[PDB]
Ligand binder design. Structure first.
Ligand SMILES: C[C@@H]1O[C@@H](O)[C@H](O)[C@H](O)[C@H]1O[C@H]1O[C@H](CO)[C@@H](O)[C@H](O[C@H]2O[C@H](C)[C@@H](O)C[C@H]2O)[C@@H]1O[C@H]1O[C@H](CO)[C@H](O)[C@H](O[C@@H]2O[C@@H](C)[C@H](O[C@H]3O[C@H](CO)[C@@H](O)[C@H](O[C@H]4O[C@H](C)[C@@H](O)C[C@H]4O)[C@@H]3O[C@H]3O[C@H](CO)[C@H](O)[C@H](O)[C@H]3O)[C@@H](O)[C@H]2O)[C@H]1O
Ligand SMILES: C[C@@H]1O[C@@H](O)[C@H](O)[C@H](O)[C@H]1O[C@H]1O[C@H](CO)[C@@H](O)[C@H](O[C@H]2O[C@H](C)[C@@H](O)C[C@H]2O)[C@@H]1O[C@H]1O[C@H](CO)[C@H](O)[C@H](O[C@@H]2O[C@@H](C)[C@H](O[C@H]3O[C@H](CO)[C@@H](O)[C@H](O[C@H]4O[C@H](C)[C@@H](O)C[C@H]4O)[C@@H]3O[C@H]3O[C@H](CO)[C@H](O)[C@H](O)[C@H]3O)[C@@H](O)[C@H]2O)[C@H]1O
Ligand SMILES: C[C@@H]1O[C@@H](O)[C@H](O)[C@H](O)[C@H]1O[C@H]1O[C@H](CO)[C@@H](O)[C@H](O[C@H]2O[C@H](C)[C@@H](O)C[C@H]2O)[C@@H]1O[C@H]1O[C@H](CO)[C@H](O)[C@H](O[C@@H]2O[C@@H](C)[C@H](O[C@H]3O[C@H](CO)[C@@H](O)[C@H](O[C@H]4O[C@H](C)[C@@H](O)C[C@H]4O)[C@@H]3O[C@H]3O[C@H](CO)[C@H](O)[C@H](O)[C@H]3O)[C@@H](O)[C@H]2O)[C@H]1O
Lengths: 552, 552, 552
């Protein structure tokens, strides 16, 4: 029977049969079942002997610090893991019972409670985010460092599926071809909730967050250091949701970390959603103005690519952000293509784009900067193209809506205040035959505004105005020009009062020679001393003559 | 050997070794394999002893009514389940072999067959949908109630994966943190195919439909009662496809059910598709006009939030509907944000939006109301903002396209008939320099229409018309105004017949004093009694004088 | 103990206990574990006895040719499979270290190396793609046929999950209700990476690619032959990524294969991404001009549906293509609805649409045809509707941007050159009140262009031009018309030089009777022989008279 049993049954060991996790790991051949809660010490390291193991978790790993898994064979999987801290830290909750952000430091301090969830441990970034909070926080709420972290170290082809926890983190250090799949809403601790860090060894590749969601955490929900997906774009974040990140929902790191670059290239960021981050929805920058460095150890030098002009080459498409307190969508880079980005209902700005020679297609920035902290709703520094930009939802100082001074833009839609648009060039080169349809007014308008002349006043207009009442079947058309900073000061009319005639403006005094522009044209003007209209005529040969046009 | 075998083998029991499902459940420790078909009686209840079980199904649960699973531990999973009724009911199939909807009751009755699929059992809603069908249906086709339902009752953290079946339903009653994942196209019965119902106990939270698809069913494919995702938006429907729902693809319930509210708050509805529903694609309403109630037991009172103005706060983005017989996309609520909704090729209306102070961004409503049942393609009752609205595909009475009388709209695209637009305000405030490009005409046009004056006639225009033939290198520009309900009745021309001159309309009789509008302007008029043009002049000082302008 | 062990343990056999895969398959009851590498011979066939098996792979299947799995029960699953060829073939790599495509045949030949990855084996299509390469390739690099293929033959309800490999392929032949799920980036061989082929038996249905990704391969990444999803749209590709297909990312086959149709109907193509295909991103055509046939054995005849006019009825939405060398998005068919397609940064054309009576909603074609091989960026042959079309990113001969000569289009955005637009009709019927905002110029413009007259010259304009300098508070409005192929040749001005008057162009010589268009209008003209302006008057009764208008 022994011989036949060894052949016909599935091999699995279970933690309930062993005093330590290493003892279970050493015994395992195929399956390993975590069927009892396991208290680990920070830095406890398990050697899985290169075995291709299917680890099924049905209980908790309990501990502050890192439980470190090593030497898992390619194809290993870890399902259902649940990390939990031993410490219950002090957390802040900078939002109200109506889900309004709290921005006042004293109000934020008043939210303090001891809990493993429903808030986060204050960080040094909170000292900037909530000015004055550093002074107001009690000592027990500063400098806390509670996270229970599963660390997969120097493994290839390992997947963590359906992970969850409380004050929980997941770290893949020096790994390749690893994935965090269908995260089951872990509640975060002090460190990032999901981290792929490849500061030592080869640049990270094949590392993804696929599906799932996270909540809370003091810093970013999903973050990458020194990963390069290659031209194949083999890595990144797809199908992911982040809620209430203490920093950002999805972050590509900037600057030097330790002795080398933390930056990232060639990753996918797609089909993902970030809601209510304290800082950014997506932060896809590689150079940061928060800690400026004059070189890039381990990366391209400044001499090759200036600050914010790295050839980052990320594949970025179909992203949604709502409720950001900092910036909904932030990035830098040169030669970038970005598409189908929707940022709505944000207390902070919608987009902050330190990009050059880049293209943005179908962007929607809807009711952002709702607090008015920031100078604009969308900012672009460099020479970029925007093709399709929706601005303004239902929310109404002097802050700009779009400040993109070197960018050429087409296809704005929405009830934007034109004085709050600043671009290099705005144009609709390819419209068809047009109709302007006016509702709730006695007139329809096609206005012109020359921003060099004035950003706040229309310089001319083509109007149609009702004659008499509704259903009169009659209107007059009006062609106007600005004078003395008074819109519509001078105008020509057709059919005013249904008269069937053109009303023609004339110069109110003797016209100077230089008032007339073109040959074979005349300019009527008033001669008060004889009660007559004269005409300044530029003849077909270009010479001037003055004629009498209308007399008593 | 016994001691070593107990340590090295995976624990699983299988239904083939037990006379009842409860006997198997009681024996199970880790795995439970369903390896024989199992006939259950309606209401048969299995107590899983709080155990965290991995239930792998490789055979059918056969029965009319509910198989009830209770006391599953958090982390339990049920994979591959297949439910099948014992009864083969009478089903209707209200569509043709060319996939046209049948709307005639007699034609629908003619489709009757006995089958567990390819149709659905008639409901009381069919009596409204197909008027007269209540009288025409035979008795054996009315009042049928066949569903084989897996009921997960009062469990936390249970997931049903890759479920399928025939006349099949899946019910999570009083559950939290449960998921219906990758539904493998179950064919529905009389009840909803996937239901999260939390009428008793705490409001449902953490309950999702993720991925997968369903077909048929008499009512809605995926539906929620008394769920609230919280600010974290922890619940809803993501990545799901519904085909041929007898009611709607995705439904948030409205009104009172039993003694309390069935409504829902703070859910996600994203990245999902509904095709060929008999009623709606997505029905995200919370108050229903189908059964109006004057109060809301267990919810906000009418005094706090009027009908259709609940702060529902759902996260709604990236939805597709095609082929709806009722409304593609229906909702209500106040303060809603909705984005990236595409509704196309629907016999019923595209969108029915009983919303107030809400924002709709990038909506496409393309070839809907193709039967002409309804008054419009998109309706909005309250004071909302629409930023980006695509209307009209290729399909061509007096029904409106958009009736949104309190809404401010920007960015309509498509070959909409302007007379079929009704909004509070329509504007393109932020276009750049413009070009109107005309193809297939001898002219280009920029028209104006004042809807208060006339919804069907343009009130003025700026035209450019070819002089002579193609390649003449010559055109004339024309500025027109409506008179006597005749578009373009009165006009000024520049370069007609390549003459290089302006043709100026004059008043055809003696002009009244009040015909002239502005100071320092003149108005030419005809004096037939002397064959001369006169000028009514409003001098720079505002006083009137009449002068002779042109004479024999 | 034996009796109790047989009841309490999970059944699984493992390949390490058997000399052949068939011996393991015959012994299996529930699980089968592939725990040793297995060398198979091409055509090696395994009979799984109709058993519903869970096959867990933790090692390689090694072999050139096909490993054929048969008689798997419905619900069977195969996870983690890794296919690898025994041969290391010669592969080409037609792209540079800066990820530019190589188009020169000699440069492509220079890339030749022996590898199982990082390139592909040349095919007969490469002879067309890289002209001259057929002559330049060495014999050892032509006619190679290396693929290691897992073939699932004539099974229902089988799923392959997390598959990978090197020179790897996956073939479902004569299968139904089967799925390729979460492909773990297999690197392809000579044949398609994922193929559903149903040339014999019933039309394929229920067959999907869901999630995952592939890299390389000589032909298409995911492809279908003779599948019909039904009205239920039960099959297709959802959530998939293809990189560097040697042919196309996703292909529906065209034409006859063997003795019957290879075409496909009623499939979904959604939420998917194709990057850097050598030919197309998505090829959703059913009739091909590459091998024209005059009939359609096994499909609709040409007499019923002309070439390219099949009622294909695919559900097509939310697709992204970047980096295509051939066409980003190709299709044919009649009565098609297509939505939310984004094609960017392609060396080849963006879209090639041999469609009729079809509707395209929210299309973006951004920086395509960047090499200039092709005649246009987007082509449409038949009578279609386009509602929303974004054109031009940041890239700048005589090639058209859109050539859609029978199509009616609305909602173009972007810096398109108007001379490179060709459509049947272009119109914005439903805009609101309009403002044209000009940045970086001393004027704002609303231009008109009659393409029948000239595609390259505006025929008229409404301008506003600054008077004096910025902040003068003054501008003049100008209404212009083209003459002698000189834009703006003839114009009327209002407020030039802040004169508050209208400058009126007059006919430079004696006006002919036919120069005046409308009754009750006058046309000023020059009489040089008396230094006077005359007026050609068309009286209210329609008769002509000449009057003196201005005199010395
Ligand atoms: C807030 C701002 O918002 C947006 O503007 C913007 O887009 C920025 O990205 C964001 O700024 C943060 O990030 C940028 C870099 O992208 C910084 O330039 C910026 O810092 C500037 O602004 C601050 C407000 C100023 O106070 C300082 C100024 O320079 C800001 O950085 C801050 O947030 C970071 C998180 O996003 C991070 O916490 C920064 O901490 C410093 O730098 C890091 C590298 C040091 O990290 C070690 O200690 C941390 C303990 O607090 C660990 O969390 C960390 O682990 C993580 O990285 C490692 C490599 C990875 O393996 C796991 C990750 O979780 C790292 O931990 C290692 O060392 C510790 C030792 O204490 C421990 O032993 C671990 O075991 C070991 O792995 C950190 O100490 C500190 O120097 C913070 O300033
Ligand atoms: C059709 C219309 O389309 C769109 O306009 C619109 O957006 C609407 O939503 C939609 O209207 C339906 O839904 C709204 C509410 O959202 C109703 O207001 C509307 O009803 C009005 O219009 C009808 C056309 C009129 O005939 C009546 C009028 O008030 C309409 O309701 C109809 O459809 C519903 C399905 O969407 C539902 O079937 C309605 O049935 C009534 O109300 C329900 C609550 C009663 O339900 C019990 O019996 C049903 C048996 O038929 C079970 O399906 C049901 O189970 C479901 O809910 C429970 C709580 C959950 O646990 C499981 C779910 O599947 C419920 O079952 C319980 O009781 C039965 C007893 O028979 C059984 O014992 C079960 O074991 C138990 O769980 C139903 O009896 C009836 O009163 C229907 O009117
Ligand atoms: C390139 C072009 O790009 C885009 O314009 C466009 O949209 C086109 O789709 C694309 O054109 C290809 O596809 C179209 C049809 O959709 C063709 O019309 C077109 O061919 C024209 O253009 C060429 C450039 C010219 O040289 C010839 C001209 O007619 C072009 O076809 C070419 O690519 C195809 C791949 O996409 C395919 O390789 C064509 O090969 C011919 O036709 C196929 C059907 C024959 O296939 C058998 O042999 C192949 C070995 O090379 C196997 O890969 C193939 O297996 C596949 O199909 C079977 C049915 C399925 O079960 C598994 C699939 O992988 C098939 O294999 C069977 O037979 C072989 C025998 O050698 C073997 O025994 C297998 O075991 C068995 O299953 C092929 O032989 C050849 O006639 C190629 O011309």
């Amino acid at each position: 029977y022994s011989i036949e049993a060894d052949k016909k049954f599935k091999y699995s060991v279970k933690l309930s049969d062993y005093p330590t996790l290493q003892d279970a790991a050493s015994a395992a051949v195929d399956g390993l079942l975590i069927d009892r809660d396991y208290n680990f010490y920070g830095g406890e390291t398990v050697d899985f002997g290169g075995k291709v193991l299917t680890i099924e978790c049905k209980a908790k790993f309990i501990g502050d610090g890192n439980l470190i898994f090593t030497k898992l064979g390619k194809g290993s999987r870890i399902a259902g893991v649940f990390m939990e801290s031993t410490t219950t830290p002090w957390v802040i909750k900078p939002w109200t019972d109506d889900n309004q952000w709290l921005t006042d430091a004293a109000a934020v301090v008043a939210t303090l409670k001891q809990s493993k969830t429903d808030g986060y441990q204050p960080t040094v970034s909170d000292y900037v985010k909530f000015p004055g909070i550093e002074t107001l926080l009690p000592p027990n709420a500063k400098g806390q460092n509670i996270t229970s972290t599963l660390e997969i170290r120097e493994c290839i082809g390992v997947e963590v599926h359906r992970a969850s926890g409380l004050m929980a983190g997941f770290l893949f250090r020096g790994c390749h071809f690893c994935k965090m799949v269908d995260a089951n809403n872990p509640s975060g601790g002090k460190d990032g909730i999901i981290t792929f860090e490849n500061l030592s060894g080869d640049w990270g590749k094949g590392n993804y967050v696929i599906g799932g969601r996270t909540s809370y955490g003091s810093v970013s929900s999903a973050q990458f250091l020194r990963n390069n997906g290659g031209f194949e774009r083999d890595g990144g974040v797809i199908g992911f949701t982040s809620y209430r990140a203490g920093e950002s929902g999805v972050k590509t790191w900037q600057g030097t970390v330790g002795s080398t670059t933390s930056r990232n290239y060639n990753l996918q960021f797609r089909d993902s959603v970030v809601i209510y981050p304290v800082w950014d929805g997506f932060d896809l920058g590689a150079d940061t103005d928060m800690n400026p460095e004059l070189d890039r150890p381990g990366d391209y030098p400044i001499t090759q690519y200036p600050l914010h002009q790295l050839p980052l080459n990320h594949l970025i498409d179909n992203l949604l952000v709502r409720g950001a307190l900092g910036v909904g969508f932030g990035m830098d880079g040169k030669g970038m293509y970005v598409s189908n980005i929707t940022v709505e209902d944000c207390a902070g700005s919608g987009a902050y784009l330190l990009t050059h020679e880049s293209v943005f297609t179908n962007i929607a920035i809807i009711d952002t900067n709702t607090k008015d902290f920031q100078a604009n709703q969308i900012y672009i520094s460099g020479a970029c193209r925007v093709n399709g930009l929706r601005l303004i939802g239902i929310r109404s100082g002097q802050s700009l809506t779009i400040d993109a001074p070197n960018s050429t833009v087409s296809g704005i839609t929405g009830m934007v205040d034109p004085s709050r648009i600043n671009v290099a060039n705005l144009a609709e080169e390819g419209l068809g035959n047009i109709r302007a349809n006016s509702f709730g007014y006695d007139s329809a308008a096609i206005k012109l505004r020359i921003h060099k002349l004035s950003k706040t006043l229309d310089s001319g207009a083509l109007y149609s105005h009702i004659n008499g009442g509704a259903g009169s079947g009659s209107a007059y058309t009006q062609l106007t020009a600005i004078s003395g900073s008074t819109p519509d000061a001078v105008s020509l009319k057709v059919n005013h009062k249904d008269c069937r005639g053109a009303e023609i403006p004339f110069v109110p005094d003797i016209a100077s020679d230089d008032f007339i522009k073109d040959s074979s044209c005349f300019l009527p003007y008033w001669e008060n001393n004889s009660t007559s209209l004269k005409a300044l005529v530029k003849k077909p040969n270009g010479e001037l003559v003055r004629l009498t046009l209308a007399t008593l």
